[PDB]
Ligand binder design. Structure first.
Ligand SMILES: CCCCCCCC/C=C\CCCCCCCC(=O)O[C@@H](COC(=O)CCCCCCCCCCCCCCC)COP(=O)([O-])OCC[N+](C)(C)C
Ligand SMILES: CCCCCCCC/C=C\CCCCCCCC(=O)O[C@@H](COC(=O)CCCCCCCCCCCCCCC)COP(=O)([O-])OCC[N+](C)(C)C
Ligand SMILES: CCCCCCC/C=C/CCCCCCCCC(=O)OC[C@H](CO)OC(=O)CCCCCCCC/C=C/CCCCCCC
Ligand SMILES: CCCCCCC/C=C/CCCCCCCCC(=O)OC[C@H](CO)OC(=O)CCCCCCCC/C=C/CCCCCCC
Ligand SMILES: CC(C)CCC[C@@H](C)[C@H]1CC[C@H]2[C@@H]3CC=C4C[C@@H](OC(=O)CCC(=O)O)CC[C@]4(C)[C@H]3CC[C@]12C
Ligand SMILES: CC(C)CCC[C@@H](C)[C@H]1CC[C@H]2[C@@H]3CC=C4C[C@@H](OC(=O)CCC(=O)O)CC[C@]4(C)[C@H]3CC[C@]12C
Ligand SMILES: CC(C)CCC[C@@H](C)[C@H]1CC[C@H]2[C@@H]3CC=C4C[C@@H](OC(=O)CCC(=O)O)CC[C@]4(C)[C@H]3CC[C@]12C
Ligand SMILES: CC(C)CCC[C@@H](C)[C@H]1CC[C@H]2[C@@H]3CC=C4C[C@@H](OC(=O)CCC(=O)O)CC[C@]4(C)[C@H]3CC[C@]12C
Ligand SMILES: CC(C)CCC[C@@H](C)[C@H]1CC[C@H]2[C@@H]3CC=C4C[C@@H](OC(=O)CCC(=O)O)CC[C@]4(C)[C@H]3CC[C@]12C
Ligand SMILES: C[C@@H]1C[C@H](C)CN(C(=O)c2csc(Nc3ccc4c(c3)OCO4)n2)C1
Ligand SMILES: C[C@@H]1C[C@H](C)CN(C(=O)c2csc(Nc3ccc4c(c3)OCO4)n2)C1
Ligand SMILES: [Ca+2]
Ligand SMILES: [Ca+2]
Ligand SMILES: [Ca+2]
Ligand SMILES: [Ca+2]
Ligand SMILES: [Zn+2]
Lengths: 221, 361, 369, 52
């Protein structure tokens, strides 16, 4: 079953080739690193609350209505499913008269839910949006590079058969000179395409100043 | 301020050529090297305000200090005519190119002490000045490796350890400038790729200078992309993308020797490959024998994939018996290989689905 | 920014090295850097010219350890955690040594403190080793060796804090989040330990007496609701949660998760600002629903909106969708109040889940930009 | 002393760099006008000298 899941996960290898879903897949994939970075802290807080709840409800193995926070595995499972809202609130009630521990558990579970569902999840959404902005800034070029890598993986002459049936057995100098001259000219033009700044204009004012001095001296003579 | 000297500096700064000429002719007691409130003599002011006749008049005067700094300031501000006029000074008789010669005052220099005129010209991207200096043999020294252990590098490291890194990054900034790359080497694209790779390598090693080295590698990549952008016919496109087709042997019966494209992919240029000039060649290589299949719709290509999935055993059977054929040569195409592998994966997924055919309902 | 050689960098960052005495055997007299930090310049320190000097100070004797990978540094932290008793033993006997001078480095101090915290967290984890897989008061109340180690760690943390409040002063020490949270955590730990000690004292008196002795022999099912053991366990659980919350102190050091933690933390102020209004609307709906369903204590199918505590709990869990809709139905024939409750609950859900939560998301995005 | 020398050097360098960065600003209408009035005054002076 796990191998079937992984085999169907492998289906994303050839999707970069398609123009419709290539750049979309690349953009989604570029977010996974930030998702993992956030998930590290998520797991840290998860371990915090898991160990706290396990230490709280370790003794009341039979008093609890369910086995939610009895063992480490059960506490991990309950807190994990609390993320998706699949864990109920009755996992805090105790059949014994002691309301101190029950209310401590209520407060801890509420703090955990506020931290995870409201705070951490919304901050994850914000992080994903912030990353996806700059991802969309350069999505086309990155998708083009990925598709080029996919093409170059097949440009080789080695493999021709698929997985089935696989088991059985000078001018250049002239062109460079021309292109370099063209690049020099184009770079000079692009430099000329810049905005005039104070220094540049001043150099012109000093021209007029020197011209005026020369002309007035010639007039004096 | 010895009002004669103040008047001389005032005339020099604002291009009063007749007054400065008459003073140079008739004073015989004026201090030529007198400086203003910012420690700038007549030559530095004239260079700064771009006065050519005053510059020539001062250059003809001997015992004139601050000439190397004058050249450096002229280069940093462009001023090609002034740079050429200064280079004709006897101090630059092809001997001072690339101590205390470049100081702009009693203590210190205008720029970093390691920034020679060629490095400064490369930094400012002054193509005329860079070409002139290169014609005079000026060269950037290509600083040693980061982990170099030679005596000179060791002395530089143990002396300052902060001027060393700044000198290294200044030399790399000069090397990575588009002007120096275009005008210095005989193979600007290959040299630019190699320098971009080297700068990318050094970006990881130096944590503080990571942004600077990444920016320089980006400059090299920009130079390569721009050089590709200017191609007009297929000959120039092949020259930029592939290289020297004479020294390099053919990749295959009709392949353009994609070795340089492989090198560009390995160096993560990311834009020399994504450029439309490279894109058209890559697409032409992608469809070697399927000239008419390019214009088909997506549904047609999906139907082709399904047909290849149906006929994969036939293709495998005919590959061994007939190596070269009308269909055999088509099957060797890269797009046909990709379609065959995708169809094989579809068959595998279908087998996975149908393995549980006993309990679908 | 204009400095070119190390002399100018020292002149700008440190000041006059002649009038100012040396900070240590090789320190550059960081007094001006302290002043710049106190004045929140935020960019005179973050500049690469200052960054290189701070990094050089950070690794005084660990010249080669700078180029190691993150896994190597994690291994170093684990090794320091293993060998902390040896380091403490050799510090007293040999003040100056090849290892002793290395231990005095600031990075080694940070690694030692982080490894000590890892040891404390491991002790907290292993204190419940009896019931990882699964599961007479004199036996229960007595301390274990793990418990004694945890008590010693807590006492050491409390004494270190006290030293800090003495070396900084009341106001200086206080206005700091770590100091504020470390005080609460240590207070709760001390409360748990004191409750456990009181339970042990009562058990010891009962055992010394060998009626007044029958109560202490009762099982947990018949224990008093206000027993010190229960309070101790609850306070210990909360203190464990706070101790694991303290783990974020050393995460800013890492480049991978430092800026991410700072960015997430800068949103908490806006989250609190929104939560004030959230609590206002919550109080509104809570009091309305409590006044609506106060009388139908027995008619209701459940006790959701019977008391103020129950109404608060139901409305809080409605935020996460853990509260059902049957909390509105009434077994009586009166549909007027039942439909009033339906309308109020629907308005509450629309305001909270849809409106307020989406506006909180928008506020978080606007801040995070 | 050494510190005074270094401070003097760095202050001079900062003055020069600040002037350059100011020169790195975009020209605006007022600045260009000051130049037009130069040419105007130069024209008046030259025409007066020609008249004489
Ligand atoms: C969005 C993504 C969110 C991801 C959040 C994820 C978050 C996961 C965080 C880490 C996982 C921790 C618990 C994992 C677990 O299942 O418990 C383990 C218990 O194994 C033990 O008995 C020892 C448990 C040690 C407890 C200390 C771990 C916490 C770190 C301490 C640090 C100290 C410094 C495994 O259980 P199990 O035994 O396999 O149960 C099966 C029962 N059976 C085997 C009998 C059938
Ligand atoms: C995202 C974050 C969302 C956060 C939203 C949070 C929102 C919380 C808003 C404030 C909390 C209010 C209720 C708190 C509560 O639990 O009820 C209290 C009842 O205590 C009383 O009996 C008096 C209640 C006064 C009611 C008026 C309070 C509202 C403000 C009026 C303004 C007037 C101006 C406490 O209950 P308890 O008695 O401890 O119950 C335990 C039972 N036991 C002790 C017997 C075991
Ligand atoms: C912190 C701010 C201060 C507190 C704010 C409001 C404090 C006022 C709100 C809560 C006070 C009422 C608690 C009453 C109580 O005793 O129990 C009620 C019930 C058992 O009768 O049990 C429950 O159902 C309640 C379960 C919810 C517990 C309260 C909600 C916790 C919110 C905590 C957020 C932490 C911050 C998020 C993470 C930030 C990290 C940077
Ligand atoms: C306000 C806009 C005007 C109303 C809009 C649509 C009004 C039209 C929609 C609702 C009308 C039908 C109400 C019928 C009814 O009698 O009950 C039905 C049922 C019991 O038979 O009970 C229920 O299940 C219904 C529970 C949902 C109540 C209606 C939804 C409330 C939406 C309110 C939003 C408030 C605004 C959000 C906060 C803004 C703050 C600035
Ligand atoms: C048909 C439905 C009901 C089930 C689909 C499951 C698979 C059979 C699908 C999933 C992903 C599909 C593949 C993903 C995209 C492509 C790329 C596509 O090529 C293009 O995008 C056209 C442009 C180009 O080839 O350059 C050829 C079909 C193929 C391999 C698809 C073939 C059919 C696949 C494997
Ligand atoms: C931010 C942190 C560092 C401040 C410290 C928090 C604790 C001191 C607070 C937080 C939650 C509080 C608890 C939540 C609610 C209750 C329920 C209450 O239970 C009862 O009703 C007593 C039993 C009875 O009714 O007879 C006892 C107090 C207690 C445990 C509170 C005690 C004080 C606690 C632990
Ligand atoms: C920074 C640190 C050092 C602050 C430490 C503060 C403690 C010295 C104080 C503050 C709160 C006090 C606690 C408040 C509540 C209790 C519950 C009490 O147990 C009961 O409620 C029994 C009541 C009964 O049997 O009827 C035992 C004392 C204790 C731990 C108190 C012990 C002394 C404490 C811990
Ligand atoms: C090992 C796993 C299974 C459990 C981890 C729990 C703790 C033992 C972890 C949680 C946070 C970790 C710490 C957080 C980050 C750092 C900073 C790290 O230093 C760096 O980031 C390298 C750069 C530098 O030191 O300047 C040294 C390890 C340390 C203390 C980590 C040590 C191990 C810690 C305490
Ligand atoms: C925006 C605000 C200021 C306008 C005022 C709102 C009220 C006048 C509305 C809002 C919800 C309405 C209630 C929601 C639905 C019902 C159910 C209805 O219950 C019944 O079916 C009657 C019992 C029976 O069936 O015999 C009685 C009217 C009532 C209470 C409505 C009365 C008018 C209410 C209170
Ligand atoms: C960054 C995106 C995140 C998503 C996973 C979708 N992403 C695809 O592009 C994609 C399309 S089908 C597929 N296969 C697959 C199947 C089961 C999987 C799985 C992947 O990951 C975990 O379980 N992945 C990439
Ligand atoms: C602004 C961010 C918000 C999150 C809390 C994650 N944040 C961390 O950086 C972080 C990583 S581990 C941790 N410790 C922790 C454990 C239990 C906690 C708790 C904090 O708050 C409430 O309960 N906090 C900061
Ligand atoms: Ca310009
Ligand atoms: Ca001029
Ligand atoms: Ca502290
Ligand atoms: Ca301006
Ligand atoms: Zn060397």
């Amino acid at each position: 079953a796990i191998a079937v899941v992984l085999s169907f996960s492998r289906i994303a290898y050839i999707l970069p080739a398609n123009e419709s879903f290539g750049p979309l897949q690349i953009s989604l994939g570029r977010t996974v690193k930030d998702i993992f970075k956030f998930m590290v802290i998520f797991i840290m807080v998860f371990v915090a609350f898991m160990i706290g709840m396990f230490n709280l409800y370790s003794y009341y193995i039979g008093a609890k209505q369910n086995e939610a926070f009895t063992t480490v595995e059960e506490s991990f499972k309950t807190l994990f499913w609390a993320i998706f809202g699949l864990s109920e609130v009755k996992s805090v009630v105790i059949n014994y008269n002691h309301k101190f521990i029950e209310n401590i558990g209520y407060v801890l579970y509420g703090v955990y839910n506020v931290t995870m569902v409201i705070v951490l999840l919304n901050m994850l959404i914000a992080m994903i949006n912030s990353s996806f902005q700059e991802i969309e800034d350069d999505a086309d070029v990155e998708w083009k590079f990925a598709r080029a890598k996919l093409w170059f993986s097949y440009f080789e002459e080695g493999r021709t058969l698929p997985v089935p049936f696989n088991l059985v057995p000078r001018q250049y100098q002239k062109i460079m000179k021309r292109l370099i001259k063209r690049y020099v000219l184009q770079a000079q033009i692009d430099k000329e395409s810049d905005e005039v700044n104070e220094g540049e204009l001043k150099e012109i004012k000093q021209d007029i100043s020197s011209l005026r001095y020369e002309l007035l001296e010639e007039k004096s003579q | 301020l010895s009002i004669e000297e103040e008047r001389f500096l005032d005339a020099a700064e604002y291009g009063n050529i007749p007054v400065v000429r008459k003073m140079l002719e008739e004073c015989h007691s004026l201090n030529v090297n007198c400086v203003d409130y910012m420690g700038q003599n007549a030559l530095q002011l004239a260079v700064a305000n771009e006065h050519l006749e005053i510059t020539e008049l001062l250059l003809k005067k001997e015992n004139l200090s601050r000439v190397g700094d004058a050249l450096l300031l002229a280069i940093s501000k462009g001023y090609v005519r002034i740079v050429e006029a200064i280079l004709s000074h006897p101090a630059f008789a092809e001997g001072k190119r690339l101590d205390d010669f470049y100081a702009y005052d009693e203590d210190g220099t205008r720029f970093s002490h390691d920034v020679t005129p060629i490095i400064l010209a490369a930094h400012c991207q002054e193509y005329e000045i860079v070409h002139t200096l290169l014609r005079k043999g000026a060269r950037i020294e290509r600083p040693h490796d980061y982990f170099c252990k030679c005596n000179d590098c060791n002395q530089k490291q143990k002396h300052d350890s902060f001027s060393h890194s700044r000198s290294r990054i200044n030399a790399y900034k000069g090397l990575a400038s588009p002007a120096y790359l275009s005008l210095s080497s005989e193979d600007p694209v290959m040299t630019a790729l190699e320098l971009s790779n080297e700068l990318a390598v050094l970006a990881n090693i130096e944590k503080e200078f990571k942004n600077d080295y990444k920016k320089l590698s980006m400059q090299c990549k920009d130079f390569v992309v721009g050089l590709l952008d200017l191609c007009r016919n297929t000959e120039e496109v092949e020259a930029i993308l592939n290289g020297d087709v004479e020294t390099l042997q053919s990749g295959d019966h009709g392949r353009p020797n994609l070795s340089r494209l492989k090198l560009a992919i390995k160096y993560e240029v990311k834009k020399f490959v994504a450029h439309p000039n490279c894109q058209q060649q890559l697409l032409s290589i992608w469809y070697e024998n399927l000239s008419g299949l390019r214009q088909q719709t997506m549904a047609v290509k999906f139907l082709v994939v399904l047909a290849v999935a149906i006929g994969l055993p036939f293709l495998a059977l005919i590959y061994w018996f007939a190596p070269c054929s009308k269909m055999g040569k088509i099957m060797r195409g890269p797009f046909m290989k990709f379609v065959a592998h995708a169809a094989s994966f579809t068959i595998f997924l279908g087998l996975l689905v149908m393995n549980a055919a006993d309990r679908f309902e | 920014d204009l400095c070119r050689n190390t002399e100018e960098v020292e002149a700008i960052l440190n000041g006059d090295v002649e009038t100012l005495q040396s900070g240590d055997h090789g320190r550059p007299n960081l007094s001006r850097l302290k002043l710049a930090i106190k004045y929140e310049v935020k960019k005179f320190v973050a500049h690469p010219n200052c960054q290189q000097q701070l990094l050089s100070i950070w690794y005084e004797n660990l010249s080669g350890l700078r180029q190691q990978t993150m896994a190597v540094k994690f291994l170093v932290v684990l090794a320091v955690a293993i060998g902390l008793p040896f380091l403490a033993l050799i510090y007293w006997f040999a003040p100056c040594s090849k290892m002793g001078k290395i231990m005095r480095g600031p990075f080694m101090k940070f690694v030692a403190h982080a490894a000590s915290f890892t040891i404390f967290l491991g002790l907290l984890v292993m204190n419940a080793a009896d019931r990882f897989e699964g599961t007479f008061r004199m036996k229960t109340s007595c301390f274990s060796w793990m418990e004694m180690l945890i008590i010693s760690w807590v006492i050491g943390m409390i004494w270190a804090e006290c030293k800090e409040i003495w070396t900084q002063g009341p106001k200086e020490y206080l206005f700091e989040l770590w100091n504020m949270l470390d005080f609460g955590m240590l207070a709760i730990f001390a409360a748990s330990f004191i409750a456990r000690f009181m339970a042990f004292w009562h058990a010891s008196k009962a055992q010394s007496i060998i009626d007044n002795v029958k109560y202490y022999n009762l099982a947990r099912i018949k224990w008093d609701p206000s027993d010190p053991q229960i309070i101790s366990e609850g306070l210990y659980a909360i203190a464990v949660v706070l101790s694991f919350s303290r783990i974020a102190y050393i995460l800013p050091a890492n480049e991978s998760f430092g800026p991410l933690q700072i960015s997430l933390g800068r949103t908490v102020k806006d989250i609190f600002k929104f939560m004030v209004i959230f609590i206002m609307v919550f109080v509104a709906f809570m009091i309305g629903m409590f006044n609506l369903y106060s009388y139908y204590i027995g008619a209701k199918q459940n006790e959701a909106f019977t008391t103020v505590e129950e109404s608060f709990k139901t409305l809080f869990w409605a935020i996460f969708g853990l509260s059902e809709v049957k909390s509105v139905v009434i077994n009586y024939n009166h549909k007027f109040i039942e439909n009033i409750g339906y309308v109020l609950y629907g308005v509450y859900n629309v305001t909270m889940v849809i409106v307020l939560l989406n506006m909180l998301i928008a506020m978080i995005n606007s801040s995070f930009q």
